[PDB]
Write a protein that binds this ligand. Structure first.
Ligand SMILES: *CCC(=O)N1C[C@@H]2C[C@H]1CN2S(=O)(=O)c1ccc(N2CC(CN3CCC([C@@](CN4CCC4)(c4cccc(F)c4)[C@H]4CCC[C@@H]4NC(=O)OC)CC3)(OC)C2)cc1
Length: 481
């Protein structure tokens, strides 16, 4: 329910008023995910979904304030609007789940209870809507339009469990999928949403098969297990400032940035690598005085992945590579992509890993070829003269090759082979042969660049990659075999 400590912070007439609600809620023993999700969804609806201020609606008002280059109008989050939305969600869940039929074995939720709550959210959703549609992530979307995206369903099941008083059910997250963790010690797992366009319904099952398979989608078991404070962080990361494909809401960007600094200062981003990359992206768009630089924050994201997730995360390095690409730091961008491939090499490319395959396919066959083409234009009256860039390029392909090893389906096809030959060809023979590709001589220690290939394909190509005249057919045949 909604208590006086929560209600007295209403109405929310500004960005700072919303931040104050979150600061107060994060200080409570059990932060209300439902209330916080509804507020974000309410403000996102008028700032990005439908910006046209309503004429025939009398209770709904907007708050004017000076905009940095006339006025800007903020949707006033009234207590009557939010409390009614909150009451509707609570009434729906409590009315559909009869907790007398489920024996709570000393504050522990059974699989049967978790599956019922999952079924309630699932059966409430609209029969037909676009899944990749923007702004269908919040509980406002579930209540006002019965639409939720893939990870939104997972968050809604967790929100609904908290409303029923189930403190043991928590959000589990990978870098592209969401499920729930429950039971004593939070070692019990259950699928609550779908994944992919048409990849069937594994709802109600454990994630064991996906973890044992070594797919990037289940991160070999080193996935995030959220506490209530991390579920608030997920919800803040989930804020979508997009108005259309090319424009953003300046208020939603400012709100997400302020909310991320709030979570950071309380230490709730310490185990959330992608939130730190998101904050760094926001800091580059609008730096806030006295705060650390985007580069410091990207490396804080990588450090978190290394410390708490045994360096098995892809996107922290991807975020850093993104920064260097935008700023045209060819060496530093290629280094970060090679570091991404060093992570993916110990995974097996499975059917449902399309999201990360598409990301690597685009860097290897569009982004990197575009970078080296632009660099070649600049040489006609520098990075292509650096043998370190060439070593980063080879380590990147080494990672993709090793990733393909032990995989049920191939990664590299004729489409990749062309861009490898073209990218190798962007570096002169003299620059390419400066790189020493060694296996090592002695193991351990007693009391031009150097590179070691972990993959069979790049090892067999060793001499060809360094030869003055590139044998295209042989390099293409070995990469695609
Ligand atoms: C020169 C620059 C250039 O051309 N390019 C091309 C691209 C961009 C730039 C550099 N390259 S790149 O190196 O190939 C590259 C860099 C960075 C990224 N991205 C990070 C990104 C995606 N995040 C991953 C997490 C999601 C998540 C939604 N997913 C997307 C499909 C569904 C999600 C997270 C976890 C579990 C999930 F099930 C889903 C959302 C759901 C709600 C919260 C969550 N987001 C966060 O946690 O945010 C921190 C989206 C964010 O960020 C934009 C793209 C890719 C390539």
């Amino acid at each position: 329910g909604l208590k006086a400590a929560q209600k007295t912070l209403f109405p929310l007439r500004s960005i700072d008023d919303v931040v104050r609600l979150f600061a107060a809620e994060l200080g409570r023993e059990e932060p209300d995910l439902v209330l916080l999700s509804l507020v974000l969804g309410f403000v996102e609806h008028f700032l990005a979904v439908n910006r046209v201020i309503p004429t025939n609606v009398p209770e709904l008002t907007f708050q004017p304030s000076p905009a940095p280059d006339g006025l800007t109008y903020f949707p006033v989050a009234d207590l009557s609007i939010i409390a009614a939305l909150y009451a509707r969600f609570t009434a729906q869940i409590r009315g559909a789940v009869d907790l007398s039929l489920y024996p709570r074995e000393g504050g522990v939720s059974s699989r049967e209870l978790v599956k019922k709550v999952s079924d309630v959210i699932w059966n409430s959703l609209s029969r037909s809507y676009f899944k990749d549609r923007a702004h269908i992530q919040s509980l406002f979307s579930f209540i006002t339009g019965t639409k939720l995206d893939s990870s939104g369903v997972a968050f809604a099941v967790v929100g609904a469990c908290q409303a029923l008083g189930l403190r043991d059910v928590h959000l589990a997250l990978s870098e592209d999928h969401a499920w729930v963790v429950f039971g004593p010690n939070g070692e019990q797992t259950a699928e609550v949403t779908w994944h992919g366009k048409g990849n069937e319904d594994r709802r109600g099952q454990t994630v064991n098969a996906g973890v044992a398979e070594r797919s990037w989608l289940y991160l070999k078991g080193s996935y995030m297990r959220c506490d209530r404070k991390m579920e608030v962080a997920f919800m803040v990361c989930a804020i979508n400032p997009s108005i259309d494909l090319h424009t953003d809401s300046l208020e939603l960007l400012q709100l997400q940035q302020k909310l991320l600094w709030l979570l950071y200062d309380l230490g709730h981003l310490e185990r959330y690598p992608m939130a730190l990359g998101n904050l760094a992206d926001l800091e580059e768009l609008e730096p806030t005085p006295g705060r650390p630089d985007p580069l410091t924050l990207y490396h804080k994201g990588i450090a978190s992945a290394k410390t708490y997730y045994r360096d098995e995360h892809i996107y922290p390095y991807m975020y850093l590579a993104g920064y260097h690409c935008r700023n045209r730091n060819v060496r530093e961008a290629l280094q970060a992509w090679a570091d991404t491939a060093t992570v993916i090499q110990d995974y097996n490319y499975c059917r449902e890993d399309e999201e990360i395959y598409k990301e690597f396919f685009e860097v290897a066959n569009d982004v990197i070829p575009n970078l080296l083409k632009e660099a070649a234009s600049l040489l006609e009256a520098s990075a292509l003269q650096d043998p370190e860039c060439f070593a980063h390029l080879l380590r990147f392909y080494d990672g993709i090759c090793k990733w393909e090893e032990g995989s049920p389906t191939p990664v590299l096809h004729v489409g990749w082979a062309t861009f490898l030959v073209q990218s190798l060809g962007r570096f002169e023979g003299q620059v390419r042969q400066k790189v020493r590709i060694v296996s090592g001589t002695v193991a351990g220690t007693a009391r031009g660049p150097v590179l070691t290939f972990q993959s069979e394909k790049m090892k067999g190509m060793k001499e060809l990659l360094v030869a003055t005249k590139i044998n295209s057919s042989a390099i293409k045949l070995q990469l695609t075999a």
